[PDB]
Amino acid sequence: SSNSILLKGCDRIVTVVDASTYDAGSAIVSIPITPDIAYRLGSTARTFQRIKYRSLKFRVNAQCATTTAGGYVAGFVKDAADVLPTGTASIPYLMSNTGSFTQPWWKSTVHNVKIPQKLFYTEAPTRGADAVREYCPGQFHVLVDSKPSQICPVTVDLEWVVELHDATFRKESDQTAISAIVADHTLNVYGLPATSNRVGHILISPIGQTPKDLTPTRFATFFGFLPDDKFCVRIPTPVDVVLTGDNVYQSVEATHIRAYLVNGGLGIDFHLAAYNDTTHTIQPIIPTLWNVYDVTGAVTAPFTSAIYDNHVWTHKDKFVPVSFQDEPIPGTVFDYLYPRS
Amino acid sequence: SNSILLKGCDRIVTVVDASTYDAGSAIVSIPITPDIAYRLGSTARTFQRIKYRSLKFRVNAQCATTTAGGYVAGFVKDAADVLPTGTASIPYLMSNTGSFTQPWWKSTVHNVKIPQKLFYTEAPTRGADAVREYCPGQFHVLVDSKPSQICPVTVDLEWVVELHDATFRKESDQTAISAIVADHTLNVYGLPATSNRVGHILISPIGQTPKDLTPTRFATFFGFLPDDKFCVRIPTPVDVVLTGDNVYQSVEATHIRAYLVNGGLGIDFHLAAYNDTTHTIQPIIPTLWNVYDVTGAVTAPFTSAIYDNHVWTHKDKFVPVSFQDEPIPGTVFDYLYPRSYSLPS
Amino acid sequence: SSNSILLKGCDRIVTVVDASTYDAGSAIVSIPITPDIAYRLGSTARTFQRIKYRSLKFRVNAQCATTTAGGYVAGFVKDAADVLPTGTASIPYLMSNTGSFTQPWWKSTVHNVKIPQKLFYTEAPTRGADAVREYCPGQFHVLVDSKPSQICPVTVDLEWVVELHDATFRKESDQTAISAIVADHTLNVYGLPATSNRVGHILISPIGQTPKDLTPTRFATFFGFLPDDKFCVRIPTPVDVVLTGDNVYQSVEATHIRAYLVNGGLGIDFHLAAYNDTTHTIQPIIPTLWNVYDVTGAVTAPFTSAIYDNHVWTHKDKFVPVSFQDEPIPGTVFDYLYPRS
Amino acid sequence: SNSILLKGCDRIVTVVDASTYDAGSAIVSIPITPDIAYRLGSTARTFQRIKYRSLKFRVNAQCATTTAGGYVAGFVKDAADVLPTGTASIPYLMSNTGSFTQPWWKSTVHNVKIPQKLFYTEAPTRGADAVREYCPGQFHVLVDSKPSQICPVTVDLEWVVELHDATFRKESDQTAISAIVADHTLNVYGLPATSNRVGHILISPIGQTPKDLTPTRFATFFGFLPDDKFCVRIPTPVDVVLTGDNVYQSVEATHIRAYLVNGGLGIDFHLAAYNDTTHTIQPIIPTLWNVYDVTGAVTAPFTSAIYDNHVWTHKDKFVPVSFQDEPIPGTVFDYLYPRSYSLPS
Amino acid sequence: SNSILLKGCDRIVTVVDASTYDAGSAIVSIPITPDIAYRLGSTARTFQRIKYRSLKFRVNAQCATTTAGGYVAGFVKDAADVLPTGTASIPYLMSNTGSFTQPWWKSTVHNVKIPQKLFYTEAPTRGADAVREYCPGQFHVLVDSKPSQICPVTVDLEWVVELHDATFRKESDQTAISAIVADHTLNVYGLPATSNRVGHILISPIGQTPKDLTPTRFATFFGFLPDDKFCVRIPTPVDVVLTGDNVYQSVEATHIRAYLVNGGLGIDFHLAAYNDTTHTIQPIIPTLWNVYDVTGAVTAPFTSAIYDNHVWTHKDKFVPVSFQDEPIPGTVFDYLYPRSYSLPS
Ligand SMILES: [Ca+2]
Ligand SMILES: [Ca+2]
Ligand SMILES: [Ca+2]
Ligand SMILES: [Ca+2]
Ligand SMILES: [Ca+2]
Questions:
Q1: Residue C330 to chain A, least CA–CA distance (Å)
Q2: Under 8 Å CB-to-CB from B297, ≥6 apart: which residues?
Q3: Could you state, in order of their start, the residue ranges of all structural domains in chain B?
Q4: Closest to D123 (Cα-Cα) out of D170, D155, D181
Q5: Which residues of A touch C89 (CB under 8 A)?
Q6: What's the CATH code, domain B1-169?
Q7: How far is Cα E31 from Cα E83, in angstroms, rounded to an integer?
Q8: Ligand number, closest to the Cα atom of D81
């Protein structure tokens, strides 16, 4: 038998590389409060089933030089399910949630939230539906009120104090979905000019001009971290691909973006990919390399040509980091392979 | 004010068959640190210091009265003391105040009066390793006399502690890893200069002649399967001497690293060190070893190389580090290089 | 017989020349708390064996103009042994230590730490192992959260109040290890082109471009102070050197960087060096000048050529100031020979 | 049980002649550890922690009632603290609590007031040597003013102690030696390359010319007689370069070993290291140094060796170890290699 | 002081397998002397007299609850008394007070009622070995009915004792060896006069033909490994007759000594005695045996020697002594010449 405890403490809850390019109404911060966010809380809360948040104090510091014009609104919505309105008019909504404050970028805010008399679970349900309100007392937002003029990186710190009950040990946290660290760029796949060399490839287009290939250095400016040869991420909505060649046809649901090796195992490039039932691994959908079973049960690579439907990804898209088996990698493993900055 | 009182219960050692262990050897010899229990560990990592109110060890042995033989348990008082590593483990362990001897079929609980001192929760990362600062002592369960038939043994720990001074740490900074088998060794030979086998790591079964380290053997030596980016910091650096035309350089092989050969089908293992040029641990092959001259330009002027012979046993501890020499964490290593799951250590 | 006392006071604990070039996650401040740091405390604590820190209040002032973007995290770890994780992810660790605060460079922080009911010694053990936790209640860090944009020098002041016991008089403090005052430079020894003039010499390479000779003025920009003709410092890890000439060979463990005279006693240069058993002094390892005993007991300088293994030192390296006898010089003597700035 | 109260009186330090001690130097400089006294140390072995209740240092100074001068004695509280090697030790020690002067003829019994802390009873066998854990401080006796005539001084200790937490230490004691006399050093030489005593250990006095070890010469440097079974671990390894017919190897001379010379009726000393082939510490001699190769065969192809020069002083700490560098017990060493009976050791 | 009351519990005898012991033979036959137990013996050393207040023998018999048979245990009061080497030991031991039978699986804690007499704490170093002075009696455990399967038995002792009259014993312990196995003897031979191994020690099994000492053969006879520094005093001297060119001397071979053979990479054993010239124990070899004469000069005129035959058995008590027949300490011998760790020794 075990006991229930009362913990106090504080952690970094979220850190942003200057998301100044984000236009008015964009949410540069919007994290749903679970023990998983904080390192220290998330370590102890891992040894309990049920948590009760008696006080959450948020500190929003923007390291934006006093010469930066513009401002923000920060605040806490007491509903896990609630999601903010489209850009421009999110500001007056968030403001109507008590404890919300409006401030110029160079000033900092402090938000004392209280959520007593409500007992949550400490993990999203593994089996069953994701009833988010069962384990989340709300989400904390920081909306850009007026676009900042210069380098404006933001940070939120939580000063928490909680009750924890019903002792049990959980597994390590899987790495959550990732989005871009910048709102003036887009990843793109173009399959149109079929005679092109890089036609199934992921490319970064500055929203303005013509798209470029994914240099790891670019990948880093877009995602925050540097890519390795086993970077695989789940795609928000599958991209249709169609293999072909010699009275053989097969359509392929492209569910991932895999990182593969470019020329004789010295470089690295990114490609639409899918789980290949031959290899039991997520592979880049190259016609000459894509193997398939036939009725006999034998493996063959009959494909020569392929056509990719175009797609676009934005800063608003959520990519899930996974292994080549489509297993969500644990957080600590991700944090190790992908140091931020 | 930050400090708490945590009660809990946890598995210390997982089920093992005592009938495979010899007389005198321990089924358990475990220094007490919060990092052994799961529940205890994962909370106490968020604290700096700790006091052990209560510790009750449960030794469960799930076998019938037919099994002959017994075990000997107890708690040593200081973490510095080291039980003699023979079959004398018994008479020594039996001398300490808390000492139980039972038949294998009889299971027991053992309460340990622990000095009410505040220990640190973690070993020192900096300065000297004053072991008595963070460990109140080791718990032991020895094999007095081998069990006559299959007797499986487990150890649970009913713990109650106080935790103080709030901090945070992860599972483990690094990991150490030794061999699983004791009748082999790993070797580097550079003695027959002209051989294409020099510098490469090999597996000698102590009596037998040495042969090339291939994944299948690697498994049986280390417990897990190697790969492209397996790298390890060796305990003793190995001297290596590169040369060319008007050129000479001494290079301490600080790592054993995996690299890929004949197009990337197979992988071999070679002495290695951090290359100041590339900022990565590299296999120290003369033609491929790059060096700055005084002008800041990179050359690869080396053509010959001499490796000093060295040997490694089941006693040698190797530490996995990624290239760039960043030592790789425990949780992460077990994920990238998985062995069989045994709980103690 | 003597008495035990209760002292209060304050001193400068550490002062930094703008360490703005230090990238995110670098620790521009990380000093382990001992009486040796403070002048005034360190003077009285010198007359006592055992100290008990009842309150430590730190004041972090950055003199970084309000136009400087970026920020920092300061805080106190209550463990002498604990050492922070590698760069990027040190920030969330330090933050989880209570009393830690995140702030833009142009703002200041204040940290009230309490460590009562713990009695420390007032000096690192002279004989025995360096059990750091015996005489150190923890270390104070200032981590760069976001690299500052302009000249950002930092200072920490301590406002301490302590108990002192068991009276005894100690020797003067030896000068502690030194590191560079800048993270965009590296000292280097290159021995490769053996026909080169300056091949055993210490040189400063801007991480970017080709390495330069050590002008005292450069030495100052790297180390903080100006070199004298008896600057000798212990090297973190020995550099292998190999003397030779005429059927005579000898390898030499280069343990120091000595400052020697360049041309007819008017200039000064820096060289790999070792303790020469002939002269009983640490000398620059020049082949023609390196003397050795032979079996007869007679001194001879048979060496003509030499080969130095390359090495690199960084801002992260710790050099120990020593005399030519490898004696650690006392702090006051160092402070006199090497005025800062 | 698990607790006792133990009283007794033993000899802490045997006779010393203060008349031969430079002003300011200590004639007694002794850390308090239970092993310091014969009855205490033997019983304290059967426990883990200890509290020094009362410690009374009986300083028996027996100089003639004419002989002028005096001594300063005291008890410095910190174990790890070390007095200055000069005349300034006295004004330093007088600054310590409970410090005093008294003329050489006057014996005193100084009562020390030890903190009521529990110390560990033994130097830590695992981990680092944190002296502060198991020693409440040092007891000193300096020569204030060098005596004129013979000045015999001894010390006894009236002790009473609590011994707690009962466990038995093996105790696998290990000794570490240094030179007895400091008026000369012993050293190796690499040059000339042609000589016969190259890599051989020699004693070089202040008088420059080195000389082999008689070994009655060895006797005067260490304080005991050698033995063909003598081996010692070096504080700093010495680089030795073996070479032969198209072969080359670097070797760390980690030991000084004694070996039989020209038909076994002689003994000399040489640089040595663990030989991986022989599984023992051998003298690094080219023709006698065997090595494996890629095939697994043993070979002695080496014809010459280049030893680096290296000196050793009184300051250097040697450690005796049987071949295969196995630590020798305190009582075994003191038997095989007996130094003049002194106290403390 | 000068008196204490000491309590504790140690291991009296380690595991024995009763299943390999002929009926009536003792698996435990142990005289009670403070050194018998690790904590007791160490402290009892710092006193002179002792009173055994309570002695409780914890007999841990762990045989399977099926294995049939039983054991008889008891405590014979006289130290010097010795049980009969037969099956009649049981009816004899049952006749002793406080004697009992119990089946092999059943462990008991037998409390012994010791006379309230003070015994000396140590075997007398000067004078004769009156065992009755310092031993209150023996504790026995006979095999009543030979067990079927493996039958592990141990013993522990709950002891409480008064220790009186406080003085410290050196203690200059001295060991005495006998053969471990009795299935064969070692012997000397004098005939034929022409042979090479005459006067040499040899091992003669039940199988008649003698053989030299491998010395892994020596290992099986004594229970430990030899060493060129091995010397031993013989229970009964052996007459050796040296002779040469008109000279004749009689010699008592008082020792068996190990000596280097054919260039020192070998070892053999030979009859020996103290040589008055050399002041050491040398192998009695004609050409190597030196003697004085009326003038004071040393001479080796002897050309042949006649050794008398002599055998040695398990019964014969050897005593190890360094050259010059100086007794070797218990802890020194056990180190140099280690036998398998057993208890009692
Ligand atoms: Ca849950
Ligand atoms: Ca810690
Ligand atoms: Ca001190
Ligand atoms: Ca101990
Ligand atoms: Ca006695």
A1: 41
A2: none
A3: 1-169, 170-345
A4: D170
A5: 335, 339-340
A6: 2.60.120.20
A7: 12
A8: 3
